[model samples]
Target chain A: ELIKENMHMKLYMEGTVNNHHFKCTSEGEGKPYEGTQTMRIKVVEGGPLPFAFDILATSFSKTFINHTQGIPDFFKQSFPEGFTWERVTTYEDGGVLTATQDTSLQDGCLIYNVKIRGVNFTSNGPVMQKKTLGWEASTEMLYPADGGLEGRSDEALKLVGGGHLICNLKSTYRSKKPAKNLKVPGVYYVDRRLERIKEADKETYVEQHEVAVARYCDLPSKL
Target chain B: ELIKENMHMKLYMEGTVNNHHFKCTSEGEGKPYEGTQTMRIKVVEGGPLPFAFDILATSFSKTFINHTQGIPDFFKQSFPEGFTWERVTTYEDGGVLTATQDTSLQDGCLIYNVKIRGVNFTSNGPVMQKKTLGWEASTEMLYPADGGLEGRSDEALKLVGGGHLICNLKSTYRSKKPAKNLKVPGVYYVDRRLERIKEADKETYVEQHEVAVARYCDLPSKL
Candidate 1:
């Protein structure tokens, strides 16, 4: 059915999951392309997303040129045999939910996986932004994927895409809601194991987002 | 049924629709938050998705505390008088699909209009990686939705449980197969009017997404 008005109440946070230098690629035109991007949950014994959470990347930077000239493929778009809805884990206490797929292209089979760790974790959001600000962007570039023509074809794109061919994601930073914990059975927060994330490095960014209309229309116009 | 792997073929270019200054927000307590996110098309005439596309801020920033801690509400998530499934356009040339919802937040009845123009254009992606890359993800942050809050209060879950309230996305980006162009009878690219986004004076970021991934282990581990 349609995502009617009230249906939206069903949604969670957006843009909270930020990735840095996220990249992807295929081998020679006639070869196979294999890639995988993973996100780890750095939760404390009582962290957000502790019950069950899922993450996804939507936009893309790419190589194959469609009619739009610069329209790049999402991820699975670069392969021929394409990818399948392959999951590593789900319906468990702190599990993973993903749809990994594979395909053939450029004379080779391509293995592409769109994955995320869907865990049951305790959490909250709308934090850190008022202070520290980071971006959750997923970008990639084909290394020598050009057959190495200066590797510049996608290089120029790197100006907009990325070069690392690797996805650099920061740890999630979320807080716990004592009065707001879950009451669901079987479904537990991903961080039910280590309280305080145990380490300083583990965190979940479980917050929402915002911007004023006056700001956008008032922002510098480059176009 | 599921968004079967093969069904993903229906998706378009990942990075095709990009937004800047992406932000989410809410007004006050018991008040609906009104956000305006915009995306400008850089398409040429006869470009794919030529018509006006209405992108939405699928994820929201917030003040309300569910189980995730502090998540404000969006047009869909906020309300006694939320928006119904209204479509101004999703088919014709330059279609404007809008489901302007109603609310009682910031101003009077909050006008949570998440309107975007759905276009009929061509797109491809994933050109920047070398051998590994994941899907560009546009996630709406409410997954593994434990039915927690509800489950916590209504632990039974299924009462208002959907499991569907969590995710809605797909992967579709590959080589531009000319024959794949729209033969959808009356379907024309979104613009056919403005050779490019006019003025650029007006813009708001109203979208959420992520990229697909391939490498899960070969990746460097900091956690």
Candidate 2:
């Protein structure tokens, strides 16, 4: 007889890892230094989020954006290739220094509040039915992760004053559909978005910048 | 501005794991010792299916199903408490005595072919949206795999003085939802099937026994 609880427990485990790396480079304006803005983020299993920014920014033409949090490891590893993170625990609003740090780091200033809208998991080779000739599972996910930064130290701030960002982030995690690229397809994909909702950083001054990435161990056989 | 790709990727990752420990005490009567049989299987990452079966079989009321391929590591490690495995390769329909082994043994004679039908991934304590509200995703997939045997000491002689079994195996995964168990709702739901087609044992002598499992890290805020 099939055990009901057994099935339920196993299925719940499916709420685990899918692995990937992300890269986003944008050129929008928050009144950014009359130039393009750039940045990168790296998120991982233990909630380690490493990031980097150029810090090339100014305000009123008079610049004032600082960093307090250090960069994430993913920042330097997948460099364009190199970067620390600076944090602004308190943003100078009308010149008011209000303490705005969430007890939970995820809600902390400069920290991240990531939301994975969608993702995909696949491999290069055909994952057959272990004992048969039929192919196996290949899936995808899509979702938005909602986002910051500046400097002569190389951060780009937008607008003459200070404005925030309203982002709509998305990407693909192509597994090459069974076979191609002369690879056996153990694991690796394109538009990689196994996803990590990394909301880290202590500086509330963040406006949002570059793309991010992450990796994991729970990938399927095809992965 | 909602990102389309974002939704797709996040959803796909949801189809992954739901984590559970299946406890499938078993039963076989293909001329199988004519008694209620039982066992446990502990399957985890790598589809490393390790299991254990109580040796209470006979031959006549003559029945015998031994293992040669052996068990997996996931067997004992994940047990709140404690698991082996057996597989069949080529059988002697007549002269098809293919003693194909991974060298690592876990077979004996006259076994079965196992296939993964479908799986469900879910959560008991509504998985939240990591950073937002409105729970995340839950999915299901069902498919068949092909298989063979628990051969005999020398291989059973069915068809003449021997026989075979006809099996129709099906299972369900269930999760027990929570309202915190208290007011917090931490874990438990259903339609669960954290399925991993064990890319294992060529012989598919499966008769649905006890199920098994472990725990995890990657669940969305809500499932």
lDDT of 1 by residue, B64-102 (tens): 112111222222242333222222222111212222222
| lDDT score for residue A23 of model 2 | 24
Off by over 4 Å in 1: A1-35, A38-223, B1-67, B73-89, B92-95, B98-101, B105-223
TM-score of each prediction: 0.18, 0.18
Error of 2 at B184 (Å): 4.8
Each candidate's number of clashing pairs is 141, 155
Top candidate (lDDT): 1
How far residue A204's Cα lies from its native spot in candidate 1, in Å, is 31
For candidate 2, what's the TM-score of chain A, rounded to 2 decimals? 0.17
Judge candidate 2 at residue A16 and give its lDDT.
16
lDDT of 2 by residue, A10-34 (tens): 0000111123222221112211111
> Candidate 2: which stretches are off by over 4 Å?
A1-185, A188-223, B1-180, B183-204, B207-223
Error of 2 at B206 (Å): 3.6
- Quote the positional error of residue B28 for candidate 1 in Å: 24
